[PDB]
Amino acid sequence: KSSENAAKNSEVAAETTRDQIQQIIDNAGDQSTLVVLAQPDGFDSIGRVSSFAALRNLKPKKSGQHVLLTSYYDGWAAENKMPTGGGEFISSIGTATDDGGYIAAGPGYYWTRVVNNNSFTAEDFGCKTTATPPPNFNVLPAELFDNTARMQAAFNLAISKSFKLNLSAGTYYFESSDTLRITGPIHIEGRPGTVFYHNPSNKANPKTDAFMNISGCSMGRISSINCFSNSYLGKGINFDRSVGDNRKLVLEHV
Amino acid sequence: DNAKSSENAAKNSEVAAETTRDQIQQIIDNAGDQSTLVVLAQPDGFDSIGRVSSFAALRNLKPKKSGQHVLLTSYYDGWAAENKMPTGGGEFISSIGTATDDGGYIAAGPGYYWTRVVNNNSFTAEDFGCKTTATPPPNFNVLPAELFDNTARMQAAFNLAISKSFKLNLSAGTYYFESSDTLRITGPIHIEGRPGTVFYHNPSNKANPKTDAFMNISGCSMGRISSINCFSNSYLGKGINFDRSVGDNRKLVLEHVYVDTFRWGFYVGEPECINQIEFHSCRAQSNYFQGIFIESFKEGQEYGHSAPVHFFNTICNGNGPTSFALGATYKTTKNEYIKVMDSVNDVGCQAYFQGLSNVQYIGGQLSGHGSPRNTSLATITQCNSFIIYGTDLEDINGFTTDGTAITADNIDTIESNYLKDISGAAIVVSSCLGFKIDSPHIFKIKTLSTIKLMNNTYNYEIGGFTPDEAL
Amino acid sequence: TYKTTKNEYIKVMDSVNDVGCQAYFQGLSNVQYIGGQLSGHGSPRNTSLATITQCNSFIIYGTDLEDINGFT
Amino acid sequence: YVDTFRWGFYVGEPECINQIEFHSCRAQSNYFQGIFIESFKEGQEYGHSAPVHFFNTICNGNGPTSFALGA
């Protein structure tokens, strides 16, 4: 009775408000999409670049544009992981040397990363991690992607711009005839579980060739890395004077 | 009665519809004559993008398709009424399927979930719903102003940091804990606090308030924990307990970790669980019995040890029962009363080392400010190669194991009746091979001697410390 | 014998009389070894745990030393 | 690192550096001293700060050179 009267008035008022919303949304001919953007999930309406190669092929109308990169490689959703290596980029008109990390160059333009807190991760350069193998003798990890050239680009950027390099847990696989070089002062910070795994198969002298060479790294800091090879071949870290003295380098949990 | 109950739900639907209409009207009014692109173009256009208000709202937000990115302003809403800024927010990505809810990393609903986007392999505790508050003074029974228990959310945060190997960042302020469960680290981890980070522990809900550990560390090989200040203001419980329930803490490093006003600051009570551990710049202060308590095995038990153990620039100060503590009674939040003392003859010491090997105490300090009842400053039993490099030792108030005060008047009597007692010096060494001390400055020692040797300590070596300080 | 990813084989050993040690120091000065450990767990063939040659001022502070399997 | 001042690290009163720590620091090419710690001067009340820890710190090339004296 009395409850029913208010319950039916509620239906009438709700329908009138529905008609009012219909009317105002129809009247707002050119502004109705602002209602779409203001919803709690409105940020999804903004577009973003899918991978670093797509970013290389993206032609900017004018210098100074800002864009979002979701991840370095696409296809993380089909697998069971999260995007990685993404960020924000700014366009410039001109020529610059492609880096694979910092700078994505195309024909007559390029894009540069916005770096926060003077630090970046190795995933930003296309490095991949996998499951850590056991320490048994001739045992290799399950997935074999060689990180040597991409990790050397990351080291070069960290030495040149004096950013800190951050490394994620997992194993990075290395199998190349070149040795990984550190050529000036650098900050490197890993996580418990960061592993560098070295396969000496492509080396010219597997018995004596160094995996990592460090030289000229004054006042640098390297921390929380675990290198192993499971081979009984090679040098693990070779300290050198090809660039200069490592005057006050600090190694901690290596 | 069903009609009267559903009337309120109908009115709630009415109010929600009217408020919706009001938001659309507000948007259209603010937009004005200008087109959508122009509005976006305006220097403040970023405000026209919708955001989730809180983590619960995100749990209720149903994604149309997997792969959407959304923004979360803060973990809790209402920060603007309070005079503080949002915290705990970020970006989330949707997935269609089932996953175990977390309260942090993953917000799960029926048939969908949202996953947080983590930057630089690190995250904060606010991301998991933890709250801070103003720090209480160190007085005896003083609680912080507002009491929100952080135990289960901080436990979830530790689980994520161990599982995904992210670094856990903590903010200034006190995290309050009052729970019947002990906070466990079970794997390698990085924890980094700020100057001002405090963990306050309330033992009122513990089953054994006197002996139950606040925090438990096991298996933490290669971890690093820094810049945290744990205190409890109760003279009850263990501060941090190291176990082998998961494994050995094989090269764990602690820096700037302070533990105050528990019953024992740092506690170890079984063998082979602190091999190669490091304490840098740590502190244990005003605990009831000991600041550091290491005891690999008890008497009659199978022999065992952990080795080596390293202390660098660590200071233990004020540990041991004072007269106030002896007479004090703790009042719980359930209005219980717990007597702090065990007996009226209680004594303690600053540090206690038993059953270890290759121990180094470099620098640092061991002092007795505030006049607690101590048998010694350090007590060393059944160790091999304990070495002391330049450690400041000062201000002991001397007692025997029985509780008898050691003054000048009775000094001779003590020497006759307590010869075999493990007490009566600033440093007591008992059954220790390879003991060594260089020449630190020692002063204000109210005890029979500065160093005491007993129980087959047979190749010791004593450098020249400050002479004529004892009785 | 190590098997490479190109199906090559490499003899791990150099000679059937190979010996090693844990740490080798030659031609240094003012060296401090504070704490730590040097140990032969797993029974490798060692001439020593630590070999020090042609140095000025090598100092060891409390290092743990254990478990050597002696060879010339 | 502190270089080419008159003093690099200066302390001139008691009870202000209790338990301070220097790791891997440098004082180089200052005019008088690299590290200068002085709790009290002559005729002043006794005081001190304690303990004080240096770990792998270097003081190199401090003091007045002939060029510095003529500069």
Author numbering:
A (entry chain A): 155 to 408
B (entry chain B): 152 to 622
C (entry chain A): 480 to 551
D (entry chain C): 409 to 479
Copy text from the publication:
In the present study, Klebsiella phage GH-K3-derived depolymerase Depo32 (encoded by gene gp32) was identified to exhibit high efficiency in specifically degrading the CPSs of K2 serotype K. pneumoniae. Phage depolymerases specifically recognize the glycosidic bonds on the host surface and randomly degrade them to release the repeating units (oligosaccharides) of the glycopolymers; thus, the phage particles can move closer to the cell surface and bind to host receptors. Here, GH-K3 gp32 was identified to encode a depolymerase, Depo32, which efficiently degrades the CPSs of K. pneumoniae K7 (K2 capsular type). In summary, Depo32 effectively binds and cleaves the CPSs of K2 capsular type K. pneumoniae via the putative active center constituted by Glu545/Glu423 and Asp546/Glu423 and initiates the hydrolysis process, causing the pathogens to become sensitive to elimination by the host immune system and thus achieving protective effects.
To understand the whole architecture as well as the potential modes of action of Depo32 on the K2-type CPS of K. pneumoniae, the structure of Depo32 was solved by cryo-electron microscopy (cryo-EM). Atomic models were built into the 2.46 Å nonsymmetrized and 2.32 Å C3-symmetrized maps and refined iteratively in real and reciprocal spaces. Both the nonsymmetrized and C3-symmetrized maps presented well-defined electron densities in the core region, and they all revealed trimeric architectures, similar to the overall characteristics of the previously identified tailspike proteins with known structures. In the core region of Depo32, since the resolution of the C3-symmetrized map is slightly higher than that of the nonsymmetrized map, and because of the inclusion of the potential CPS binding, catalytic and/or regulatory domains in this region, we then focused on the C3-symmetrized map and model to perform the subsequent analyses. In addition to the invisible N-terminal anchor domain and the helical-bundle domain (to residue 185) that may form the head of the spike protein, the remaining core region of the Depo32 monomer can be further split into the following domains: (i) a very short neck helix and the connection domain (residues 186–271), (ii) the β-helix domain (residues 272–642), (iii) the connection helix domain (residues 643–666), (iv) the carbohydrate-binding module (CBM) (residues 667–846), and (v) a C-terminal domain (residues 847–907). As is typical of other TSPs, the β-helix domain of Depo32 adopts a right-handed solenoid-like fold that consists of three β-strands in each coil turn that are stacked approximately in parallel into a triangular cross-section. After the β-helix domain, the CBM of Depo32 presents a β-sandwich domain that exhibits a “jelly roll” fold, which is composed of eight antiparallel β-strands that are arranged in two layers of four-stranded β-sheets.
